[PDB]
């Protein structure tokens, strides 16, 4: 049901990037054109880690080639910014990325290779767990990698696992329907927005919030588009956070 | 109605040198004002930069040596003795970047921030628990305030961004009433141990684990502080819980 | 005086563990051993410090002396790799051993000598405390020295800490003996690594804990390291102790 991580993601609203950002109220015209089509619009977490994926029961890393930049061998394209969108198998030195399997010292890779460790929505939808999953059970699907070795671990996660993007349902955020021949209801959506991820629930333990929509599109914001810092010491655990 | 920070605060209790720690003996002037009839009012320390808002604008806190130069628009407010300074403020400088950044953003602005407004964390309206709120400048005018965040004293309090708050807002609960520690018109005061009752709140109390310190505000405007290392305890982000999560 | 046993000697691993020693589905040959014997297993938090002892009423750090180096004075063997296991009284450069005494600026030391900061359970068994005592009340027994200066704090105190080793008592543990045979018979349960990983992992305490030693009745003790499940210890993967729910 939700969308897969292959090209560069819009921002909600309109940023201007001085090289900080500078946020406006304008919503993307893309966000508005299909908000207005119907699409159904389901906010989900960000989470801070690296682009993966599960393609026929491995792991693949994201990697963006710059203009005239060797193209690794086994790198498969699925997208295009100015550089290109695509994945790869992981090399030998991917020690953080194969850490994610679950072990197994009895093997000649010492890795049980059919498994990796997930964090993921419980049997209720009130909290996260983590759970050893069969790899096939992601099979065809974008993750995020988390843990220790990975953006220094600002989720506090106890060991390195995936998480299938979208999982994390988003409550009581900004409908962003009411900003959209009628004038729309609401205007300040990056007021709003930034309430939200400051005195919210969820926003505390969020890098951000990324749109999946009906249409396969998404629409991202971080907490740098909102004036806002992410780091260990403004974040606060993932596995405590509410669902 | 809380007091402002135009001075060095004293202690609440009578400290000994070794680093300064706090003895079981309470500041002879807050024995006095609490005998005067005195209402002590414990609030929360938290750990940033003194500011305040003079007329509409942020002023930072800047202490002189007095054989130095005063900085232009300078305001001496008072005067510490042990070292000697002189207390005062500033208007910000071109350089002050994170003070600055405490103003909400604004594109409409030749300099991108509205400058009437700043981002600064308060008492919700129940008064349960601190949030985040976006507020006219104005409001804050002629009030002395902790500016706090990533870029200050490296976020002990894991605040997601740079804000302002008033001094005293954090009103401390389970706090010892020191009156009970001062001779009432003669007699032998109730309890004994003020160090120990407050160093076992610091470290057992539901809002202790979350605060710098604790600072009496006095209907004199009179204030006493103690900082966690008078108590001889740890200062730091791994020792301190979320000040936005806080209890109140 | 307590019912808790005494880390004089290393402790062995509750799961037979690989090579990095990674824990595997097997319990420790003496552990199956103990249990069937009848012992009393009680399951206690593992804290991250350095281990030390009250003896008379002086605070003392343990040293293992290698095969190959001399006794320091006034230091007393306690158990046996193949260096001996001992314990010291502390020399006057281990500023943060002393640390977790009361503070006293009248006394020549700077120290109240006769009383120490520990944490330890309240009055009911629902959450940790901050408490000064006597030091003699600790006389005999073990303690974890914890605080800022002692593996980064990885446990969030607020101050240098005694804690007496075995003082938080594990809820929803894996109880062992469902994992080893019973009167001959098939044990009810097999995956004791699963189980175990798992508690760590989605336990309320577990988060809080660099690991898990069981006490024995039989002053056996046995242990598991987050290392041994293949977990991360450190501040950042690690919930503050004083809020670990009991
Ligand atoms: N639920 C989610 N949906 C989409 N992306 C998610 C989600 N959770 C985490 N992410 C991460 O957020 C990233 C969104 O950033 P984007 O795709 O624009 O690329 P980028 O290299 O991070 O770009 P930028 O430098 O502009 O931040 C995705 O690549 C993915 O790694
Ligand atoms: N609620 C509060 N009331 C008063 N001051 C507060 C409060 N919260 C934080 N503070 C800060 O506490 C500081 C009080 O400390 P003070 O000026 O006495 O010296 P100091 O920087 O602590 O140094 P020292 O311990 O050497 O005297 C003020 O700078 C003020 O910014
Ligand atoms: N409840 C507890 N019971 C026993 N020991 C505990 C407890 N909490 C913490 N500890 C610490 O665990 C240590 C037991 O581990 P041991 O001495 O065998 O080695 P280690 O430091 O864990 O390392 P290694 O795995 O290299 O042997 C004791 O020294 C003690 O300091």
């Not at 997208?79 to 994945?87: E, R, V």
């Not at 929505?121 to 070795?149: R, S, W």
């Not at 004038?183 to 969020?206: C, M, T, V, Y």
Request: aromatic content about 6%; glycine content about 8%; hydrophobic content about 35%.
């Amino acid at each position: 049901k939700m969308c897969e991580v292959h090209d560069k993601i819009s921002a909600i609203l309109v940023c201007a990037h001085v090289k900080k950002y500078l946020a406006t109220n304008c919503l993307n015209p893309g966000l508005i054109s299909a908000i207005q089509a119907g699409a159904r619009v389901v906010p989900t977490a960000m989470t801070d880690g690296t682009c993966c994926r599960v393609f026929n029961g491995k792991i693949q890393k994201r990697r963006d080639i710059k203009p005239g930049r060797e193209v690794p061998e086994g790198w498969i394209q699925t997208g295009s910014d100015g550089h290109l969108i695509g994945f790869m198998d992981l090399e030998k030195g991917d020690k953080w990325h194969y850490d994610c399997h679950v072990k197994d010292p009895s093997s000649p890779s010492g890795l049980d290779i059919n498994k990796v460790l997930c964090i993921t929505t419980n049997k209720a939808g009130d909290a996260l767990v983590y759970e050893e999953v069969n790899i096939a059970d992601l099979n065809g699907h974008t993750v995020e990698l988390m843990g220790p070795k990975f953006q220094s671990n600002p989720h506090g996660l106890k060991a390195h696992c995936l998480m299938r993007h979208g999982t994390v349902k988003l409550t009581d955020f900004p409908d962003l329907r009411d900003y959209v021949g009628a004038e729309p209801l609401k205007e300040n959506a990056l007021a709003d927005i930034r309430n939200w991820f400051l005195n919210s629930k969820q926003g505390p333990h969020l890098e951000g919030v990324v749109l999946h929509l009906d249409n396969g599109e998404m629409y991202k914001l971080h907490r740098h588009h909102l004036d806002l810092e992410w780091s260990a010491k403004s974040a606060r655990p993932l596995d405590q956070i509410p669902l």
